[PDB]
Amino acid sequence: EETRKIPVPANRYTPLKENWMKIFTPIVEHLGLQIRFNLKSRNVEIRTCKETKDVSALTKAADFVKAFILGFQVEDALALIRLDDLFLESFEITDVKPLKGDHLSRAIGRIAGKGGKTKFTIENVTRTRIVLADVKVHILGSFQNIKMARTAICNLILGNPPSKVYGNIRAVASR
Amino acid sequence: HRPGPLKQQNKAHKGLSRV
Resolved by: cryo-EM
Q: Alpha-carbon distance A174 to A126, whole Å? A: 10
Domain residue spans in chain A? Answer: 1-82, 83-175
| Chain A touched by B7 (CB under 8 Å) | yes
> Taking phi first (over 0 means left), then psi (-120 to 50 degrees means alpha), and beta for anything else, what does residue A54 get?
left
Q: Which chain B positions have a beta carbon within 8 Å of A163's beta carbon? A: 6-8
Query: Which residue type is seen at A74?
Result: V
Residue A131 distance to chain B (closest CA, Å): 24
**What is the resolution of the experimental data for this entry, in Å?**
3.2
| Cβ pair A6, A35 in contact under 8 A | no
Q: Alpha-carbon distance A109 to A119, whole Å? A: 10
- Residue A91 burial by CB count (10 A; 0-12/13-18/19+): exposed, middle or buried? middle
Beta bridge partners of A129: A140
Residue A92, CA atoms < 13 Å, CB-side half-sphere: 10
Q: Which chain A positions have a beta carbon within 8 Å of B7's beta carbon? A: 163
**Where would I find the H helices in chain A?**
13-18, 21-30, 56-70, 74-82, 102-112, 117-126, 143-158, 162-172
Compute chain A's Rg from CA coordinates: 18
CB contact under 8 Å between B6 and A161, yes or no, is no
> Taking phi first (over 0 means left), then psi (-120 to 50 degrees means alpha), and beta for anything else, what does residue A18 get?
alpha
Residue B13 per-residue DSSP state: P
- Phi, psi angle pair for A110, to nearest 5°: -70, -35
Characterize the bridge pairing of strands A34-38 and A3-7.
Answer: unpaired
Give the Å distances, CA to CA, from B1 to A104, A121, B11. 34, 26, 20
Cβ contacts of residue A118 below 8 Å, gap of 6+?
A: A110, A111, A112, A156, A162, A166
Compute chain B's Rg from CA coordinates: 25
Residue B15 distance to chain A (closest CA, Å): 23
Q: Alpha-carbon distance A167 to A81, whole Å? A: 32
Cβ contacts of residue A17 below 8 Å, gap of 6+?
A: none
Provide the residue count of chain A.
Answer: 175
Q: Alpha-carbon distance A172 to A8, whole Å? A: 37
